[PDB]
């Protein structure tokens, strides 16, 4: 047995080049640069192996930020079937680009586009969801308006609800909406055709989520309904969850748990499979207006003006976020940030990693306050590059940090 062995030289020597490339593909950028300078054969392996191309592709595959820039900047055109050195020179430009995006977030530097929804009578946009093509928005005038993400023009008005459209979600096939008229409606996302109406709740349907054959709805009538969707036209009630003592303002779920929150000041956790009560999250001093749940993290916003972070398994509150001056009315988070909107029209950006580290002081947690709405902020969604928010002031704002 030899004491030492040049793996990266020996393997290609033996006609096993791909193994050597695979070893090097695990390196971070700085270690791949180091490998380049080890010796001539190491350099040749990295160059002939297109390792910088392979490294950028691994990032695009594993990081939506890298994925987003590849699409938004156009260098993604060269990826997934221009020599290796092109990718080597591109990599630092991407790093600096991320840094400038992160700086814009930290410093609140952005451009702003403003859609005036021009509601004739009852003003305000209660809910919204967006992709790269469109913004689908729900309005206090009883309609759903679909906006083109690029031209900001109105492409479709969906009528049928007899009251405000309070909540909505869509996927590649359908739009599903809940309304002050106590109904849930299902619309064709392409044509707008009404496909189904669910008559179940006795009071306004305040929130819903659905994905992969199931839907959860919740209502001012203090109940949660769990639905099985075999198709847009075959939707069956599986179970009704009761136990909340006031309107259920929001519901979220995944394969582990259903999570509901209420005017009764509590968050409740239910087993998605069994619909059995699991546990109550106590702690907010007032009713809860908004919530998001993913993985182990629950994020809630309340009439007590605070935000609370919770781990779903033990129910512990991990952090209380203070700073909003009015009711926290909508909230979202991703892997880096929390974004919340309040009754005073203000939006706050929070550092989620910092917030989940109990060493960090509270005053360092709010990165920026963004003030461009003139009424209550009802809904927002965001990603690495932008925020889309909507308000009682009858506008939708896109805040763009790129």
């Amino acid at each position: 047995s030899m004491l030492q062995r040049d793996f990266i030289t020996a393997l290609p020597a033996r006609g096993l080049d791909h193994i050597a490339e695979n070893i090097l593909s695990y390196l971070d950028a700085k270690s791949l640069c180091a490998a380049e300078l080890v010796c001539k054969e190491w350099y040749r392996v990295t160059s002939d192996g297109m390792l910088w191309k392979k490294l950028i592709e691994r990032m695009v595959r594993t990081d939506s930020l890298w994925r987003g820039l590849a699409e938004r900047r156009g260098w993604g055109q060269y990826l997934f079937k221009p020599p290796n050195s092109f990718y080597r020179a591109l990599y630092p430009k991407i790093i600096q680009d991320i840094e400038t995006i992160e700086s814009n977030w930290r410093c609140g530097r952005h451009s702003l586009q403003r859609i005036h929804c021009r509601s004739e009578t009852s003003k305000g946009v209660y809910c919204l969801q967006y992709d790269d093509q469109k913004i689908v928005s729900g309005l206090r005038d009883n309609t759903i308006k679909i906006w083109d993400k690029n031209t900001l023009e109105c492409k479709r008005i969906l009528t049928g609800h007899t009251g405000s459209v309070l909540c909505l979600q869509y996927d590649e096939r359908v739009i599903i909406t809940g309304s002050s008229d106590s109904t849930v409606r299902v619309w064709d996302v392409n044509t707008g055709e009404m496909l189904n109406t669910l008559i179940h709740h006795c009071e306004a349907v305040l929130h819903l989520r659905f994905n992969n054959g199931m839907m959860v709805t919740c209502s001012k009538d203090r109940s949660i309904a769990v639905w099985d969707m075999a198709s847009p036209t075959d939707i069956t009630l599986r179970r009704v969850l009761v136990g909340h003592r006031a309107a259920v303002n929001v519901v979220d779920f995944d394969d582990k748990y259903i999570v509901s929150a209420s005017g009764d000041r509590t968050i409740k956790v239910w087993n998605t499979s069994t619909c059995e009560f699991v546990r109550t999250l106590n702690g907010h001093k007032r009713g809860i207006a908004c919530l998001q749940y993913r993985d182990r993290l629950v994020v809630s916003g309340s009439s007590d003006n605070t935000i609370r972070l919770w781990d779903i398994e033990c129910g512990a509150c991990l952090r209380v976020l203070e700073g909003h001056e009015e009711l926290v009315r909508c909230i979202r988070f991703d892997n880096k940030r929390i974004v919340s909107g309040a009754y005073d029209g203000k939006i706050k950006v929070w550092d989620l990693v910092a917030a989940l580290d109990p060493r960090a002081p509270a005053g360092t947690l709010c990165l920026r306050t963004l003030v461009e709405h003139s009424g209550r902020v009802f809904r927002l969604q965001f990603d690495e590059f932008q925020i889309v928010s909507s308000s009682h002031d009858d506008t939708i704002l896109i805040w763009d940090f790129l």
């Binding site: 305000g124 809910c127 405000s164 909540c167 006031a246 309107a247 303002n249 005017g263 009802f378």
Partner: peptide, 11 residues
């Protein structure tokens, strides 16, 4: 007053 989207424990 509150928006139609949310409600408290009142009755």
């Amino acid at each position: 007053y509150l928006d139609s989207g949310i409600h408290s424990g009142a009755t």
